[PDB]
């Protein structure tokens, strides 16, 4: 309740562009980097494990940064959610963020967040699986 | 020496550097490191070289970051504990937008710390890796 | 480009380079990883595996081509402002020279980046072809 | 649709230019992203099928949407050329995708632009084609 309602719109927008252009793009890399590690035959194990932990640490870090953004974005919606001031975003990927109806643009954004979380969670989960699989194999 | 509200405006600009430029660079570098590890191809002489290279970049950036922080601390020497602590929407800390200026000061200090932690932690890994590789030949 | 304002060219050169860094290279990094990812996948079949490489190959060639086009324009720009003060300044996080005060260095930096980029692209297409041969002989 | 013969010939130049910067800086960039997104989907093992198919349809829809927006721009750009085509007023554009748009000769700049359009269309069509192939491949992979 502290800022101008349209300033929040502008912020919300910026916030979201982070998620799309930075947060998600990092995540796509990381998913691929994981697969890449698995592909590298056996190495030793001490060496393989190390690289996952290493990966894991980065993913947790980046997930955390992502969450912080989301969090600030949700807090913004605490004011402009269910309002006209829901920002408009020509995303190439979720079609709803450009929708003329602000309800839809809200939905769109919530979806994007969920999706993003799903994917992050799902990655940390695989990495942990792999680390257990390797643990027991050694 | 300067107008108390000019310093506010500067502090704000200073901080937007940290968030929008310093941190973003750091996030990239963290990812670049991981990327190097992932790459088999090379030899070792070639692998090592790329880390040193990375290392140099990180130390360079860390240095630039420290310089900003330093200026920002100096600014707070004046407007710390005051009403003129700038207000910043931010996606990395909720306190910078807080109506209470004390909180906004705390927020900023936290951000700095967190940043330093991350930078230090990276240079540390890079050095570990460089030793690991050293011994592996 | 013998036609444009020397500082307009600076601004263009800069924009050109941000493409390479922020778009061209970022795509390339993903593609390299996508290749490795394909190799990692069992079972699929073969008809299905090959198809996905060709598919990848096509994209890489396409994106390499787009990258070359940019470079090309960038070289043409340097035909004018190469060896000049108007060489653009770029805080890249990756090549340190593009921010150098000396414009000679900034030129060198840029040339290096290009080379590096080409190396990486060429090297990828070459692996993909190897793999496609390896697979060809392993099946048909 | 409409026609332009009536606007100021240099206003059209300015518009044509703006129109083209859309294609280069927005339309093409979107397309490059989409091509990469497709490849990315194929790469993903994990999910199911109902889930895989869905994401393609989704992609497909986006591509058709974007292609449509692109066509609309082109269309306007062609209409503009109906007037300033074969003229001196063909706009001048530095470009990283075609060397001809900066050419001093306006004939060349016209050629350049036409080429860019074509190329763009080729790429868009080619993507929708692959996506449809993939969707059939997946469809048949469900069976007895």
Numbering used by the authors:
A (entry chain C): 66 to 203
B (entry chain B): 67 to 203
C (entry chain A): 65 to 204
D (entry chain D): 62 to 205
What does the report in the manuscript say about this coordinate set?
M. genitalium has a flask-shaped morphology that consists of a cell body with a protrusion of the cell membrane, called the terminal organelle, which is the scaffold for cell adhesion, division and motility, processes deeply related to infectivity. M. genitalium MG200 and MG491 proteins have been proposed as components of the terminal organelle wheel complex ultrastructure and in agreement with this, it has recently been found that MG200 and MG491 interact with each other specifically influencing cell motility. In this work, the crystal structure of MG491 was determined and found to present a unique tetrameric organization as a dimer of asymmetric pairs of subunits.
Helix α1 is kinked in its central part, due to the insertion of a π-helix turn starting in residue Cys87. Therefore, about sixty residues in the N-terminal region of MG491 appear to be flexible with respect to the subunit three-helix-bundle domain. The four MG491 subunits found in the crystal asymmetric unit present three different types of intersubunit interfaces that were named symmetric, tight and loose. The tight interfaces, with a total buried area of ~2*1200 Å2, correspond to the two interfaces between subunits in the pairs A/D and C/B (within each pair subunits are related by ~72° rotation). The loose interfaces, with a total buried area of ~2*450 Å2, correspond to the two interfaces between subunits in the pairs A/B and C/D (within each pair subunits are related by ~108° rotation). Loop L2 mediates interactions in both the tight and the loose interfaces presenting a different conformation in each interface.
